[PDB]
Every structure is written in structure tokens, then in C-alpha cells.
Amino acid sequence: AEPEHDHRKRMGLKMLLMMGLLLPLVYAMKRHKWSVLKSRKLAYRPPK
Amino acid sequence: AAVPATSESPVSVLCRESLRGQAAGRPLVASVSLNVPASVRY
Amino acid sequence: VAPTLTARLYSLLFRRTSTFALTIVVGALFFERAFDQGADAIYEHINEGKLWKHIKHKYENK
Amino acid sequence: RNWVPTAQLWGAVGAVGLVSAT
Amino acid sequence: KNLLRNALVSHLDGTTPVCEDIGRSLLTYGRRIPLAEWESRIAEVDARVVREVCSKYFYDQCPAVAGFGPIEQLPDYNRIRSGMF
Amino acid sequence: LMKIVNNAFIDLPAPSNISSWWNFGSLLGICLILQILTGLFLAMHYTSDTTTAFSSVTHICRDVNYGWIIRYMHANGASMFFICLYMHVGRGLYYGSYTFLETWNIGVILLLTVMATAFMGYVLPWGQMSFWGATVITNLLSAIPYIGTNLVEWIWGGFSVDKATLTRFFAFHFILPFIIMAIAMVHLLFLHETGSNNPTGISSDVDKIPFHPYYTIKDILGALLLILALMLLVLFAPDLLGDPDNYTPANPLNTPPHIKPEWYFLFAYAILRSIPNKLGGVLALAFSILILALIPLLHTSKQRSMMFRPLSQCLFWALVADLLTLTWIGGQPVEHPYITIGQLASVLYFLLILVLMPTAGTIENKLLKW
Amino acid sequence: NNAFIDLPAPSNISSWWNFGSLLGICLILQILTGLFLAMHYTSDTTTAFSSVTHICRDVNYGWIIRYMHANGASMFFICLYMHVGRGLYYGSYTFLETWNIGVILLLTVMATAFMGYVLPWGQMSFWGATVITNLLSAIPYIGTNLVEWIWGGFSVDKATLTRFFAFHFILPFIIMAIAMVHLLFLHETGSNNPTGISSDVDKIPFHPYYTIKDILGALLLILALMLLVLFAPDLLGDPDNYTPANPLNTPPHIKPEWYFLFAYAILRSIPNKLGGVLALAFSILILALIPLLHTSKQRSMMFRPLSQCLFWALVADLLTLTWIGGQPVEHPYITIGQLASVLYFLLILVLMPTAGTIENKLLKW
Amino acid sequence: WLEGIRKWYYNAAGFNKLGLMRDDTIHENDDVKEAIRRLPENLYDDRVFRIKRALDLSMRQQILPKEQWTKYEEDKSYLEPYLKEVIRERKEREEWAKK
Ligand code: HEM
Ligand code: HEM
Ligand code: HEM
Ligand code: HEM
Ligand SMILES: C/C=C(C)/C=C/C=C/[C@H](OC)[C@@H](C)[C@@H](OC)[C@@H](C)CCc1oc2c(O)c(OC)cc(OC)c2c(=O)c1C
Ligand SMILES: C/C=C(C)/C=C/C=C/[C@H](OC)[C@@H](C)[C@@H](OC)[C@@H](C)CCc1oc2c(O)c(OC)cc(OC)c2c(=O)c1C
């Protein structure tokens, strides 16, 4: 009923390993770019 | 030429000190350049 | 008077765009070989004795 | 100018890519 | 190079500019650098040198940016940073 | 070439604070492309004749190189499509995004078109669920007075679901996704006139950031998570969201005793099943989806988002819990006490949207003195 | 609006400018009849031919939808060739983007019609699929691999028919998107006109002037199409495709669809595999070179006698090649075809650019 | 307890935690946009800053220290006099539009 049984699991192992690598790396790339905004500081200086 | 003008034009005074020197004292002169900001003296 | 690994990786590999690309091409072909061999070994070990490649010797001669 | 050296690493890339990828 | 030569000599015109070049140069270089030396320094600059020196200071380096006025359109820093390569 | 790629992406102004709930729009774009790509490749090996449809699908899964992964990616991708669709609609309701009337109403059309599209695709493998799903759903039209039955037979190409039906459904399923793509581009064009809403419901014109690189990288991260969810299903549990009965070829003489709809249609099926009247159930079904077009007219709050509205939030989660209840009931037999739970859940669904939420809105306004 | 209603148009464009809208109509017609045929067509080799006869014999009005689709493809090419001819004669090719997209459109329509012809799986369907895909085998080192990959096997078979239905199904919609881009680039400049002189001093609104003229043109297109469908549906077709595909036998007088005959004559004139394929590709791709070969100081051929004479020689030559493509590879047709093939490239690459320069000289500029 | 529940509600709503005043959170329709356009410089600039400050906190999924939260008893409607007049003017026009 499922001749692809063993192959999908071997692939699934590779998918999990690749995601274990790519997810935190892309997340690191996301935080790198966003750091410009996350640490930005604002100040309001109206005339008075 | 090579030297940019003291003030580049485009299109602040609140004290005596900053005002001294503002009064004109000589006839007017107008300059135009190829490489330098224009000026008008006096 | 001595740099760090990342500083060296920067200077020789990442700075120039032509070299940042050659680095990825090369790294990709090397990673592919090591990753596939490694993951395949993990999969086959988790399933030791169950795969056709493990029992094949018993029937081969063809 | 820098184009030969750059066109020469761009050359390489394409080559390596095909070789490998294909 | 020609623009720079002309700026250097035309700037040192009059006693005030020369006097200032003397006072400031002794404090900055520890000596007065003569025009003939500036000429030698300028003469040796060629396209290769300009590329290498510019790359060293501008290429893939983080800039410092200051804006004032109607600056809604001043590009985001990340975009400015990527413009450096 | 530059512009409109761009000023329509690269320098597109975006709120600085949109959250992960805003990632579903791009995830829907990705689900659409995925379905289209895996769809075309499956269509290269699929044959729509009733004598060979089921067979061609097993041929894809057994003999076409990687045919199985493309097939299960298409099947599970349809599930991911709906998960994202429901998250996308939920985000819109909670944050008052529906006030962008054109964008919203086009969205309602998109939901209906994807539902119709997924329905027809499910019929293609010609298994038992394929056949009875084709039978039941097309028959919804028979509730139309005077011509209902005629419309059904015209759609079927005969007096019952047969060869003519399967062949035209392959054609409809083939083209509809591309029509969906064109409709989605219009969806986006109207959105671009206003730009995005944000969690606060307050205009973000005073704090916009460029879409690139902030949301381009955030969308890529989201895309990776979508792919992980999809592949966990394809590689570790490809049949989890499917139905065993569709592994049985279509049998026109016998409807499986525990026949039930695809999970993403269960809530609507529960609603229709709760009304012991033909026309009444069909109208309730249609209205359970079309009521989304009424949400904008039912907005009473002085505030756009539910972020600062406690009472509205409670009712919102009750609606979600209620849809979860209807989903569960749709998977249960028409027996006691499920028949009553489902009727209450069905009544509660329309009551929350038409009465309770608009009322919570007014009460909150009073509490804030405006 | 402003993309139609108040679109500025030259006051003097002639009937030769009607083919763009007629191509749009041919495209819509093919899409509409196509979808309806796809509602009854099955792509399995065991049933493809049968499903087509079923459409023509038992589906209500199936026969008219089918012959409208078949003859519609012929009308599509008549219009395409008229459209390209207008462009060459009047120098419309100077609108580079519009022109090059047009070349892509021509190739895509050709590829599209090729695949559709394979669908009924008759004899011509089968051998056309065989020959044309094999053009790729001329590609060194990997050519044969590309062919087997396209076929899904070592020969044209089921896998081929099924994917061709899918390709033929989607390509026309891609053509529609490419055509919309074709028009967008055109709108940046507006239309050229018979004089080749800017018409900005005399523009008229597209509506009502050209909307009514296009409708009149559409009526004439429909008359031509229906004369073929109702009075001679097989006139432009090939009897051999009424015979189911037979992989063991290639009909002795096999010949391409009439709109491919000129190109087939060119390929057949060269007794070398790679050479023939290169000449075939070039006979179409040379259209992309026309702009670079323009030497005249004037845009249109209206005021250029010598250029006009060479233009009609090219049309007469394509007519010659079309005739030769329909004849057996025997004397004296082999030689007439070789001369005609050489004349084709010679007129475009050498004689026309030269006439352009001579005319400039005669006008003293 | 309506006034009692009111202060409770105000804090539950929580826009005060982002430093916003109630009027900063109103849904902007054409009446509101016209009212904002009518605001005097200082009220307009203050509004802009409070919204900007709130959007920034929202992006970081953070809130202000409790001592900086808008206080229920100090929140006032700066927009009301302007919006009320804008609405009155539109109603007047709508009445006139009936013959
Ligand atoms: C094939 C289906 C759909 C696609 C491809 C799609 C895509 C998108 C995209 C790319 C955005 C911008 C990013 C975002 O905010 O998520 C968006 C926004 C939006 N969509 Fe959709 N959408 C789909 C279905 C729907 C449905 C079913 C509804 C609602 C009935 C809808 C309502 C909205 C609204 C109102 C917005 C504005 C969001 C905001 O700014 O707060 N969409 N959609
Ligand atoms: C909105 C996009 C689409 C959706 C939601 C969708 C949904 C579905 C569903 C639910 C099925 C049944 C899967 C199963 O076997 O369990 C299916 C089958 C199928 N779809 Fe799609 N589809 C989409 C796009 C496409 C496109 C664009 C094509 C082809 C050009 C296509 C071709 C097919 C084919 C050949 C099948 C039959 C083989 C199979 O069952 O896997 N689909 N589709
Ligand atoms: C699916 C095929 C095609 C469609 C639907 C199409 C449609 C159009 C339309 C609507 C026009 C405007 C009306 C006219 O002047 O005729 C036009 C103009 C033009 N087309 Fe096409 N076209 C197609 C193929 C091509 C091809 C194959 C070429 C040439 C290789 C081409 C070259 C041009 C040029 C140069 C113009 C400007 C004509 C002028 O203003 O004189 N077109 N096309
Ligand atoms: C650029 C547009 C198109 C062209 C030039 C075209 C051309 C053709 C040609 C030459 C044939 C062979 C006709 C014969 O002798 O039987 C054919 C067959 C067919 N075409 Fe198309 N076609 C177009 C668009 C479409 C579309 C959009 C569909 C379907 C979605 C379609 C569906 C069919 C079907 C199912 C057949 C097989 C039945 C038959 O042979 O009549 N075509 N097409
Ligand atoms: C030619 C094209 C046609 C006729 C398209 C029609 C499309 C109609 C709607 O889409 C817009 C429709 C799919 C959508 O209604 C809003 C669904 C929520 C309806 C869900 C639905 O599913 C079932 C199902 O899947 C089954 O499977 C085995 C069996 C079923 O009962 C035995 C049902 C069922 O009782 C209902 C209500
Ligand atoms: C998967 C898609 C694929 C592989 C598409 C390939 C498209 C290729 C080209 O279109 C761009 C191609 C159609 C176009 O070449 C420019 C034509 C003018 C080629 C004309 C052509 O026709 C023949 C034909 O029809 C036949 O019928 C029974 C038989 C034939 O010889 C026995 C020929 C033939 O010898 C040639 C040259």
C-alpha cells in the first residue's frame, strides 16, 4: 500500500536536520536586520 | 573651480555681536561661476 | 597583531562578491556530500538489519 | 577593467554550477 | 588630481591662509609640508590607488547618517548599509 | 521592468508593528504556487476517464519518479491552504481588517473559489469519497426552485455522476487556480491603495518601514515554517488529514456508512446537517460563508481592532471554540447527544456574529464614554 | 478607460492594423472552444482518438466546436502572418520591446498549435510529435537526453500524450498574459501608421472610430472562419489525421500543417541534420534581427519603391516555399526549394538593407 | 458599579499601557480624518508622538512601566469638540440634500 514508506522517512530525517539548521540561521538573519528597529530610541522635542 | 564657496545656496540673527558686520559699506558686486557658488558682495 | 577566524573568513571569502559566491558553490557541493553520507548513515543505523542493503548478501549471486 | 576579473569569476560560477547542478 | 592641485595652490593665496596653514600644520603634521611634497603625493595617485583607497574606507563599511527636516523619504539604515556594496 | 516590482514590493511602505498573523497572506501566495506547481506535474500523468482515473493516480504514486512526494505534497498542500485561509480570515475579523471593503469582499470570493477548487480536485482520483462528494455537493444546486434539478444534470452532463462529470471537473480544477491567482492579484491591488492594517487598529502612517528587508526576511522565515509543517505531514503522516475511504475506487451502488467530508468542510457540514429541511440546510450552509460579507456592516465599536476590547476578545475566542465544536460534531454520527450539541453550536455561531459581537461593541463604547 | 476608450490613435491607420484585435479574438475563440472540447477529451492513448470522434458524433454541437477550434487555429496563423507582414512593411519593429515580445508570441503560438495537433492522436499527430521534439536532438552532447526527457520515454507514447494535453491547456493562458504585456509596451508609444511619420498632430480617440472598425473586422473574420467551418471544414486539414496513430508506419506523403510548410521547406533543403535545424530556428529568430538591419532614413516602406519590390519578393518567396513544402523531395522541387531558402535569408540579410542605403543615396541623405 | 467597572474596563482595554489616550485609538473614518486635520499644532504633534510611541512598543511586544500608563482619571477627549462639529456640518449638508 505504501512502497514509498522507507524513502519518505529517510527524506523526513534529512528534512528535520536541514530545518534544525536553516530555521535558526534564517531567524538569526531576521533578528540581525530587525535589530536596527528593535533597539531604536525615540525622543519628542516640541517647541515650547 | 576646485574650491566650493563659503556658503552653498538653495531656495538668522538674534544678537548684536552676530549683527555687527551686516551693514553694507560698499557698492554691490555680483559673481557667477562655472564651478563655484554665485555671490553678491555688499 | 593576529586576526580571528571570522575576520579571516571575511577578508578572503566574503568581502569580494565573486569570492562570496565561489565559496557558496564549493561549500554547497562539500556540504551535500557530507550531509547525505552522514544522514544516510544515521538512517541505516537506526534501521540496522532491516534494509534490503543489509540482508541482500544472503540472496545475492546474480 | 575590473570586469575581466569579475567576468572571470562569473564565468567560473556558471561553469561550476552547470557541472555540479547538472 | 588637477582639481586638487588647483585647490591647494589657490587656497594658499594671501597672508592669512598661509599663516593658518603654518600654525595648523605644525600642530597636525609636526611640520609644514611644502607644495612640492604635496605635488609628489598627488602625482603618485592613479586609478589603481583611488580604487584601493576608496574600497578600504567606503566598501562594505557602516556609515554614520544624520538627517534633519522633511525626511520621511530618507532611506532606512539597512537599505543605506546595503548601498555600501 | 523595475517599477511595480519596484514600488509594489521593495519600497512598499508597511506598518512597523505587524505581527506573525500578517504572514498568512504571503503563506497563501506560497500555498497557491505550490498547488499550481505540484498540480501541473500531476496533470502530466493523470487521465480523467473513469476507467483509468484511479489507476493513473496509483501509477503516479508507484511508478512515476517521485510521483508519491508530488502527490502527497498536493494533497497535504490543500490542507495547509485551508489552515492558512482560516488563520488569515481570523486575523481579519479580530483586527478589523474587513473595513478595507474591497480587499475583504474579494477575499470572500477567494475563499469560495478555493473551496470549489479543492472540492473538484478531490473528485479527480475517483475513489469513494470522490464520487459521493461529487454527488452531494453538486446536488446542493437542486435546492434551487424550478430549475435546480436541471442545473444539476447540466453540470453532471447526465442523470448521474459519471464519465462526463469527471472529465469536465478535471478541466474546471485545472483552470480555476489560475483564475484564483488573477483574483488574488486584484486582492493585493486594492490592499495597496490603503496599505496594511496593524494589531492596534490605529493608522501607521507615522511609522512605516520599507517592506524590504524587514518583511521580505520575515516572510521567508514564515515560508520555512510553512514548509516544515507541510513536510512533516508529507514525510511522516501523509494520510493523517485524509480519508481511508478514498483508497477504495468509486462504487455508484454504495455510499460508505461513515462517510464524512474533508476536515476543512466539517464545520459547514455540521451546520447543514443540523437543519432537518433541505432548502433550510442549504441556505444555512451558504449563509455560514456569505455572512463574512456582512461583518463590515455589523461593526459597532469606535475602535478598529479587538486589541483594546476585552469583551469582544472573549466573544471572538468563543466563536473559534464554537467552530472547533462544529468541526468535532461534523465528524460524529447523527445521533444523540451530538444532534443537539450541533444545533446549539450552529445557532451559537450565527448568534455571536449577528448579535453578541455587535452588542459587545456598543457596550464597550459606553464604558469608554463615546 | 485610458487603455481603451480615450486611447489616442492615429487618424490614418488602415485595415492592416485590424489584425492585432483579430489576433485577440482568435485567442479568445481558441480558449473558449478549447475549454469546451477539454470537457469531453481524454488524453490516454487508448481513448484520445475515440474521445475526439465522440465529440464530433455525440456531444451536442460537438462537431461545430471542434471544427471551429481546428479552423480557428488556421485563422490564427493567417492573422499572425498578416500582422508580422504589416510590421515589417511599415517599420513597426522599431518599437523594439513590443516587437521582440511579438516574436516570443509567434514561437509560443507555434509551439501551442503543434501540441494541440498531437492531441487527437491520428497519424499526423504522432509523427509530428516525433519529428518536432526530435529537433532538440540536434543539440550536441545532451540533445537526445532532452528528447527522451520531453517524451517521458524512449519514444512518443502515453506519457507524451498526457503531458502534451497539460502543456497545450496552459500555454494559451500564458500567451494571453504575454499579449497583455505586448500591448502595454505598445501603449507607451501608441501606434505607428502607414506613413511611418509621427501622428501626434492628428490623433483621434480609439472609441468610437476604431471600436466600430474593429467590430467590422471581427465580422469579416467570423465570416471567413464560418465559411470554412460550415462549407469546407477539412479543406485546410490533412486526411491522414483521420487515421489513428500507427507507430510502425509513417505515411508516404506526410506533410506539415500548411502554416508550417515554409519552415519545413527550408529545413528540408539542407542535407545535414544540424544545419537544417539551425536554418529552421534562424528562419524565425531572424525576425529579432530586423531592427538591427534597418538602414533607411525613413520608418515605413510606403515611400520606398525599391524596398517595396523586395518586400513582395519575400512574400512571393514564402509562397514558393509553402508550395515546395507540399511537394515530394524530387527534381526539380529540391533545387527550387534550395534557391527559395537561400533567397529568403538573402532578401532579409542583404538585399533589403542594401535597398535601404541606395534609397537614402537617391534622396541625398 | 458602572463607574467602578469603568475604571476596571479602562485598564483591561489597556491602551493606557502603551501610553495612548482614548481618542488616539478611534477608528479613522472621513469625519475623524477631518477632525484630526482641524487640530491645532500642539494637539496634532502630541497625538502623532503618542501613536508613534505606541506603535514602537507594539512592534517590540512591550508596554510602558506602570507609572507611565495613561491614567483613567487624567484621560480627556481632546478630539471631541472637533469631531462633534465635523459631524454636525455633515448632518447639516445631508439634511439640505433632501430637497
Ligand atoms: C487565495 C487567498 C488569498 C490570498 C492569496 C490572500 C493574500 C493576501 C496578502 C498577500 C495580503 C497582505 C499580507 C497580509 O496581511 O496577510 C492580504 C491581506 C488581506 N487579506 Fe487576503 N488573501 C487571501 C484570502 C483572503 C480571504 C479569504 C479574506 C477574507 C474574507 C482575505 C482578507 C484580507 C484582508 C482584509 C487583508 C488586509 C489585512 C490587513 O492589512 O490587516 N484574504 N491577503
Ligand atoms: C487552489 C489550488 C489547488 C487546490 C486547492 C487543489 C486541490 C486538490 C485536492 C484537494 C485534490 C485531491 C488530492 C488527493 O488525491 O487526495 C487535488 C487533486 C488534483 N489536482 Fe489539484 N488543486 C489545486 C491546483 C491544481 C492545479 C493548478 C492543477 C493542475 C494544472 C491541479 C491538478 C490536480 C490533479 C491532477 C489532481 C489529481 C491527482 C491527485 O489526486 O493528486 N490541481 N487537487
Ligand atoms: C498572440 C499574438 C499576438 C497578439 C494577440 C497581438 C496583438 C497586437 C495588438 C492588439 C496590436 C495593436 C493593433 C495593431 O496595430 O495590430 C499589436 C501591435 C503590434 N504587434 Fe502584435 N500581437 C501578437 C503577435 C505579434 C507578432 C508575432 C509580432 C511580430 C513579430 C507583433 C508585433 C507588433 C508590433 C510591432 C505592433 C505595433 C504595430 C504598429 O503600431 O504599427 N505582434 N499587436
Ligand atoms: C493559442 C490557442 C490555441 C491554439 C492555437 C490551439 C490549437 C489546436 C490545434 C491545431 C489542435 C488540433 C485540432 C484538430 O485538428 O483536431 C487542437 C486540439 C485541441 N485543443 Fe487547442 N488550441 C488553442 C487553445 C486551446 C485551449 C485553451 C484548450 C483547452 C483548455 C485547447 C484544447 C484542445 C483540445 C482538448 C483539443 C483536442 C480535440 C481536437 O483535436 O479538437 N486548445 N488545438
Ligand atoms: C461545478 C462546480 C460546483 C458544483 C461547485 C460547487 C461548490 C460548492 C461549495 O464551494 C463553494 C462547497 C464545496 C462548500 O459549500 C460552501 C463546502 C463547504 C460544502 C461542504 C460539504 O462537503 C461535503 C463533502 O466534501 C463530502 O465528501 C465526501 C460529503 C458531504 O455530505 C455527505 C458534504 C456536505 O454535506 C457538505 C455540506
Ligand atoms: C514540449 C514542446 C515542444 C517540444 C515544442 C517544440 C516547438 C517547436 C517549434 O515551435 C516553436 C516548431 C513547432 C516550429 O519550428 C520553429 C515549426 C515551424 C516546425 C515545423 C515542422 O513541422 C512538421 C510537422 O508539423 C509535421 O506534422 C506531421 C511533420 C514534419 O516533418 C515530417 C514537420 C517538420 O519537419 C517541421 C520542420
Cβ neighbours, 10 Å, residue G57: 9
Domain limits for position H73: 1-99
Which stretch of DSSP H or E encloses residue G154?
none
The closest of G116, G106, G96 to G19, measured between CA atoms, is: G106
Where does residue E46 rank: exposed (0-12), middle (13-18), buried (19+ CB within 10 A)? exposed
Q: What kind of experiment solved this structure?
A: cryo-EM
Is G322 in contact with G257 (CB distance < 8 Å)?
A: no
Is G297 in contact with G358 (CB distance < 8 Å)?
A: no
Mutate to test the interface with H, among A39, A44, A45 (most CBs of H within 10 A): A44
In sequence order, the 6+-apart residues with CB closer than 8 A to the CB of F21 are F87, F91, F94, F95, F199
Cα–Cα distance, E41 to F335 (Å, whole number): 97
Cα–Cα distance, G245 to G122 (Å, whole number): 4
AA letter at F165:
T
In sequence order, the 6+-apart residues with CB closer than 8 A to the CB of B24 are B42
Nine-digit cell at G141?
A: 552532447
Cα–Cα distance, F227 to F220 (Å, whole number): 10
- Bridge partners, F208 (sequence order): F15
**Contact residues, chain H, for F367 at CB < 8 Å:** 5-6, 9-10
Cα–Cα distance, G191 to G86 (Å, whole number): 12
Q: Which residues of G63-82 are buried (b: 16+ CB within 10 A; e: fewer)?
A: eebbbbbbbbbbbbbbbbbb
* Cα distance between the two ends of chain D: 32
AA letter at E38:
W
Question: Which residue among G213, G240, G255, G294 is the active-site one?
Answer: G213
Nine-digit cell at C37?
A: 553520507
CB contact under 8 A, G38 and F178: no
**Contact residues, chain F, for A33 at CB < 8 Å:** 213-214, 217
Cα–Cα distance, H8 to B4 (Å, whole number): 65
Nine-digit cell at G274?
A: 544540424
Instruction: Please count the residues of chain A.
Output: 48
Cα–Cα distance, G77 to G257 (Å, whole number): 11
Phi, psi of A3 (to 5 degrees): -60, -25
Say whether F45 counts as a known binding-site residue.
Answer: no
Where does residue F80 rank: exposed (0-12), middle (13-18), buried (19+ CB within 10 A)? buried
Cα–Cα distance, F289 to F264 (Å, whole number): 13
| Secondary structure class of F276 (helix, strand, coil) | coil
The closest of H1, H27, H22 to H71, measured between CA atoms, is: H22
Cα–Cα distance, G325 to G262 (Å, whole number): 6
CB contact under 8 A, F206 and H15: no
Cα–Cα distance, F46 to G119 (Å, whole number): 15
**The residue to which cell 455561531 is assigned:** F349
Cα–Cα distance, F44 to B12 (Å, whole number): 76
| Secondary structure class of A35 (helix, strand, coil) | helix
In sequence order, the 6+-apart residues with CB closer than 8 A to the CB of F66 are none
- Characterize the bridge pairing of strands F13-15 and B39-41: unpaired
AA letter at G6:
D
Output the CA angle H33-H35-H36, nearest 5 degrees: 65
Cα–Cα distance, F348 to F290 (Å, whole number): 17
Say whether F59 counts as a known binding-site residue.
Answer: no
The closest of G242, G251, G204 to G10, measured between CA atoms, is: G204
Nine-digit cell at C26?
A: 564549493
Cα–Cα distance, G268 to G270 (Å, whole number): 6
Domain limits for position C26: 1-62
Nine-digit cell at F99?
A: 473595513
Cα–Cα distance, F57 to F51 (Å, whole number): 12
Is H58 in contact with F204 (CB distance < 8 Å)?
A: no
Cα–Cα distance, E78 to F11 (Å, whole number): 12
Query: What residue of B is the nearest CA neighbor of E10?
Result: B3
Where does residue G182 rank: exposed (0-12), middle (13-18), buried (19+ CB within 10 A)? buried
Is G269 in contact with G331 (CB distance < 8 Å)?
A: no
CB contact under 8 A, A1 and F238: no
Contacts of residues F203-207 at CB distance under 8 Å and 24 or more positions apart, as own/partner, are F203/H28, F203/H51, F204/F15, F204/F16, F204/F17, F204/H55, F206/H48, F206/H51, F206/H52, F206/H55, F207/F15, F207/F16, F207/F17, F207/H51, F207/H52, F207/H55, F207/H56
Cβ neighbours, 10 Å, residue F2: 6
Q: How far is the CA of E41 from the centre of ligand 1 (A)?
A: 63
Cα–Cα distance, D12 to C18 (Å, whole number): 9
In sequence order, the 6+-apart residues with CB closer than 8 A to the CB of G90 are G16, G192, G193, G194, G196, G299, G300, G301, G302
> Is G75 near ligand 6, meaning CB less than 6 Å away?
no
CATH 1.20.5.100 corresponds to the domain A4-48: yes
A22 touches chain C (CB under 8 A): no
Cα–Cα distance, C51 to H20 (Å, whole number): 65
CB contact under 8 A, C35 and A9: no
Is G348 in contact with G303 (CB distance < 8 Å)?
A: no
- Bridge partners, G9 (sequence order): G204
- The DSSP annotation for F121-153 comes to HHHTT-BHHHHHHHHHHHGGGGGSTTTHHHHHH
Q: Widest CA span of chain D, in angstroms?
A: 32
Question: Is G213 annotated as catalytic?
Answer: yes
Is F330 in contact with F254 (CB distance < 8 Å)?
A: no
Is G13 in contact with G215 (CB distance < 8 Å)?
A: no
Cα–Cα distance, F307 to F200 (Å, whole number): 6
How far is C-alpha G6 from the chain's CA centre? 31
Nine-digit cell at G347?
A: 532578401
> Radius of gyration (Cα) for chain D, nearest Å?
10
Cα–Cα distance, G126 to G114 (Å, whole number): 11
> Radius of gyration (Cα) for chain F, nearest Å?
22
D9 touches chain C (CB under 8 A): yes
**Contact residues, chain G, for F56 at CB < 8 Å:** 44
**The residue to which cell 489616442 is assigned:** G8
Is G121 in contact with G41 (CB distance < 8 Å)?
A: no
Residue contacts between F and H (CB atoms, under 8 Å):
71
- The DSSP annotation for G219-236 comes to HHHHHHHHHHHHH-TTTT
Cβ neighbours, 10 Å, residue F61: 17
In Å, how far are A32, F17, F79, F96, H47 from F14, measured between CA atoms? 19, 9, 29, 17, 20
- The DSSP annotation for E7-74 comes to HHHHHS-SHHHHHHHHHHHHHHTSSPPPHHHHHHHHHT--HHHHHHHHHHHTTT--------SS-TTS
Phi, psi of F257 (to 5 degrees): -60, -25
- Characterize the bridge pairing of strands G8-10 and G203-205: antiparallel
- Compute the Cα dihedral for F199, F200, F203, F207 and give only its sign: negative
* Residue G153 DSSP code: S
Cα–Cα distance, F248 to F244 (Å, whole number): 8
Nine-digit cell at G206?
A: 480609439
Is F117 in contact with F173 (CB distance < 8 Å)?
A: yes
Is G48 in contact with F174 (CB distance < 8 Å)?
A: no
Question: Is G92 annotated as catalytic?
Answer: no
Cβ neighbours, 10 Å, residue F174: 24
What CATH number is attached to the domain comprising C38? 1.20.5.260
- Rounded to 10°, the helix F310-330/F338-351 angle is 150
In sequence order, the 6+-apart residues with CB closer than 8 A to the CB of F293 are F105, F108
Output the CA angle F200-F203-F205, nearest 5 degrees: 130
Q: Which residues of F293-302 are buried (b: 16+ CB within 10 A; e: fewer)?
A: eebeeebebb
Cα–Cα distance, G200 to A29 (Å, whole number): 53
Question: Which residue among G11, G14, G15, G187 is the active-site one?
Answer: G187
Please provide the CATH number assigned to the domain covering F1-370: 1.20.810.10
How far is C-alpha G253 from the chain's CA centre? 23
Nine-digit cell at G26?
A: 482568435
Question: Is F262 annotated as catalytic?
Answer: yes
Where along chain A do its domains lie? Answer: 4-48
What ligand is nearest to the CA atom of residue F99?
1
Question: Which residue among G51, G214, G341, G359 is the active-site one?
Answer: G214
How far is C-alpha F81 from the chain's CA centre? 7
Say whether G182 counts as a known binding-site residue.
Answer: yes
Cβ neighbours, 10 Å, residue F256: 16
What ligand is nearest to the CA atom of residue G98?
3
Closest-CA distance, H60 to chain A, in angstroms, reads: 6
* Cα distance between the two ends of chain B: 23
**Contact residues, chain E, for C12 at CB < 8 Å:** none
Instruction: Please count the residues of chain C.
Output: 62
Cα–Cα distance, D19 to F325 (Å, whole number): 56
| Secondary structure class of H38 (helix, strand, coil) | helix
Is G49 in contact with G250 (CB distance < 8 Å)?
A: no
Cα–Cα distance, F260 to F245 (Å, whole number): 10
* Dihedral angle of Cα E10, E14, E15, E17, to the nearest 10 degrees: -40
Phi, psi of H75 (to 5 degrees): -70, 125
How far is C-alpha G151 from the chain's CA centre? 24
| Secondary structure class of C58 (helix, strand, coil) | helix
Is G69 in contact with G30 (CB distance < 8 Å)?
A: yes
Say whether G83 counts as a known binding-site residue.
Answer: yes
Residue contacts between E and F (CB atoms, under 8 Å):
9
Q: Which residues line ligand 2 (CB under 6 A)?
A: F 32, 35-36, 39-40, 42-43, 46, 57, 71, 74-75, 78, 81, 114, 117-118, 121-122, 124-125, 173-174, 177, 180
How far is C-alpha F236 from the chain's CA centre? 24
Closest-CA distance, E72 to chain F, in angstroms, reads: 9
Say whether F299 counts as a known binding-site residue.
Answer: no
How far is C-alpha F180 from the chain's CA centre? 12
CB contact under 8 A, C43 and A9: yes
Cα–Cα distance, G315 to G322 (Å, whole number): 10
When divided into structural domains, chain H yields a total of: 1
Helix residue ranges, H only, G232-329: 261-268, 273-285, 305-325
The closest of G282, G314, G262 to G85, measured between CA atoms, is: G314
Resolution for this PDB entry, in angstroms: 19.0
* Cα distance between the two ends of chain F: 50
CATH 3.40.50.150 corresponds to the domain G1-365: no
* Residue G18 DSSP code: T
**Contact residues, chain D, for C25 at CB < 8 Å:** 13, 16-17, 20
> Radius of gyration (Cα) for chain C, nearest Å?
21
The closest of G345, G350, G364 to G295, measured between CA atoms, is: G350
- Of G104, G107, G114, which is best to mutate to test ligand 6, by the most ligand atoms within 8 angstroms of its C-beta? G114
Cα–Cα distance, G60 to G66 (Å, whole number): 11
The closest of G126, G136, G80 to G244, measured between CA atoms, is: G126
Instruction: Please count the residues of chain D.
Output: 22
Query: What residue of C is the nearest CA neighbor of A8?
Result: C43
In sequence order, the 6+-apart residues with CB closer than 8 A to the CB of G50 are none
Nine-digit cell at B40?
A: 553678491
Are A and B neighbours with ≥3 CB pairs closer than 8 A? Answer: no
Where along chain F do its domains lie? Answer: 1-370
Which stretch of DSSP H or E encloses residue F96?
none
A40 touches chain H (CB under 8 A): yes
- Characterize the bridge pairing of strands B39-41 and F208-210: unpaired
Residue G62: which region, alpha, beta or left (left: phi > 0; alpha: psi -120 to 50)? alpha
Instruction: Please count the residues of chain H.
Output: 99
